[PDB]
Amino acid sequence: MCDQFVGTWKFLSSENFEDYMKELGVGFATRKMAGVAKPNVTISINGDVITIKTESTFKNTEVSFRLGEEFDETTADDRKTKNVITLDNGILNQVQKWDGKETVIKRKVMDGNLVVECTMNTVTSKRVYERA
């Protein structure tokens, strides 16, 4: 149980991410780039501010929030979102809303794997990173 969020993680595998992005409405080309990328995600904490830094990908991002507190974000595929992240039993639950629509991204540490599961409507993807 030193297996906590804080850290850097290296992409390992992916399942169904193509159809999850189709569901989000991401363009054919941006989907291409997202499916070849092998991102590194670094999560850090300072006081009560969490910073998720996504690197080694086609467009690097960085998002800082407090749990329970609404934030704005322009995503890598250029949506203008509203978000609320909360935490429960080790799982960070992110509800991201834009133009009437919603996706839920959940992240949980499993033995130095970070497992990120994204759902929108009917469609789920799982991505697995490993502790760099």
CB 49 within 8 A of CB 64: yes
Out of 16, 57, 113, 119, name the contact with ligand EIC by CB under 6 A. Answer: 57
Q: Does 21 bind ligand EIC (CB under 6 A)?
A: yes
105 binds ligand EIC (CB under 6 A): yes
Contact between 123 and ligand EIC per CB under 6 A: no
Sequence-distant (≥ 6) Cβ neighbours of residue 29 within 8 angstroms: none
Site string for ligand EIC, 62-81 (x = CB under 6 A): --------------xx----
Regarding 85 and contact with ligand EIC (CB under 6 A), the answer is no
What is the 3 state secondary structure string of the chain?
CCCCCCEEEEEEEEECHHHHHHHHCCCHHHHHHHHHCCCEEEEEEECCEEEEEEECCCCCEEEEECCCCCEEEECCCCCEEEEEEEEECCEEEEEEEECCEEEEEEEEEECCEEEEEEEECCEEEEEEEEEC
Span interacting with ligand EIC, options 1-9, 31-39, 62-70, 80-88, rule CB under 6 A = 31-39
Number of residues that bind ligand EIC (CB under 6 A): 14
Window 33 to 52, contacts with ligand EIC (CB under 6 A): 34, 37, 39
Which residues form the interface with ligand EIC (CB under 6 A)?
21, 24, 26, 34, 37, 39, 54, 57, 76-77, 105, 116, 118, 127
